Design a binder for this molecule. Sequence first.
Ligand code: AMP
Ligand code: AMP
Ligand code: CA
Ligand code: CA
Ligand code: CA
Ligand code: CA
Ligand code: CA
Lengths: 207, 206
Amino acid sequence: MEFKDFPLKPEILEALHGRGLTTPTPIQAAALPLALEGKDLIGQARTGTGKTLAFALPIAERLAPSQERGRKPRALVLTPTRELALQVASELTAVAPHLKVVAVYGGTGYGKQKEALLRGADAVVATPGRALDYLRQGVLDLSRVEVAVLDEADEMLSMGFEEEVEALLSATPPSRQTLLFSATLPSWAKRLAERYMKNPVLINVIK
Amino acid sequence: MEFKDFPLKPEILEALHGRGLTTPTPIQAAALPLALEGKDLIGQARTGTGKTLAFALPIAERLAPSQERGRKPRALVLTPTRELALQVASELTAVAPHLKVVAVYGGTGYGKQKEALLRGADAVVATPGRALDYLRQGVLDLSRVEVAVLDEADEMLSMGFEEEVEALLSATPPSRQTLLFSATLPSWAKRLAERYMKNPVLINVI
Ligand SMILES: Nc1ncnc2c1ncn2[C@@H]1O[C@H](COP(=O)(O)O)[C@@H](O)[C@H]1O
Ligand SMILES: Nc1ncnc2c1ncn2[C@@H]1O[C@H](COP(=O)(O)O)[C@@H](O)[C@H]1O
Ligand SMILES: [Ca+2]
Ligand SMILES: [Ca+2]
Ligand SMILES: [Ca+2]
Ligand SMILES: [Ca+2]
Ligand SMILES: [Ca+2]
């Protein structure tokens, strides 16, 4: 099946086509039918298998646009590094053109990021230390999050962000949809499924 | 998503609708895009999940009819018991009435089944012991199999069919699509996935 065969808004498909993307990768073709229906899932696949779109397209499809100034984000994506936060934000901006995506990460001051969050955001893509910093400061508001994504959960474990991640997830509404992506599925990932997800289906691309 | 969103022929859709079926179950929803494109999958699931239509629909869609006398089967489904073979064959006929489906199982005479295989078959749903007997005899020729399904692999393991199942898969062409259903993915199932499947996607709903 091609992207056009999936229940995706015309504007999203147009963006996909423009970016040279027509046919889902295996993780995408298996995950989208469930993720687009609002279901929780765990995606286990080598990096470069197309994991980002498997959660970006659900975020894009689920969220309607909003022009309301200072609005709080309706999606949160956590990633272990600044490099990945920038990459994921780029991709999500590109397939959710109707959404404002704000990236937050270390290696710079607070001022520009706070200014962005104050203006309003529909999705935030963040490293967990910086996100928790802003949560504590009152500038990142997670009370309206409808979709939470943990991207590379095993790297977030290996960089030591367990408490930050759990703290962030705990500040989101339990009504949310949660997607967890992790190449390996260590003990921590399993704890997260139990404690933060709703009967998620596991999709694992082997080889 | 609805069944009509998937690349299924209108007669198939009409039949599902006739039975009140419009909305795929989780395992069907996740499996069908890949299964209908000929890709290998492992479904971690038991009865109650809708796993049967997850492999029956791709068979029904893939295989055109043929009236060729003596023709060899193009789909093989292995199951642990007579009971399940009868159930699966029934469901395969329900969605693919254009295909000759032959159930092969123990606890009965050879004659009927051997006759049917010699006359020609499009799909065979078999228990592994009797299937291997027919393979040995040349009665069951697997050289044209396009889809191989291992239904309830844990039960096949628990009954002692590991050797028969491996040998039957070893006799099909590696170009085939293989779909494996195993509730617990024991070590044997992992062995099968490595030896007999190609980059399988695992879908666990239980
Ligand atoms: N459906 C697709 N077709 C072709 N390339 C894709 C598709 N989805 C993702 N990619 C690319 O796969 C690469 C790795 O993706 P990821 O696993 O998200 O890092 C990137 O170059 C993506 O643009
Ligand atoms: N999409 C569906 N909607 C409703 N019932 C279904 C669907 N798929 C399978 N079933 C039924 O679910 C029961 C268990 O299926 P199975 O898990 O294949 O043994 C059987 O009665 C099926 O016919
Ligand atoms: Ca950080
Ligand atoms: Ca920490
Ligand atoms: Ca369509
Ligand atoms: Ca037998
Ligand atoms: Ca044996």
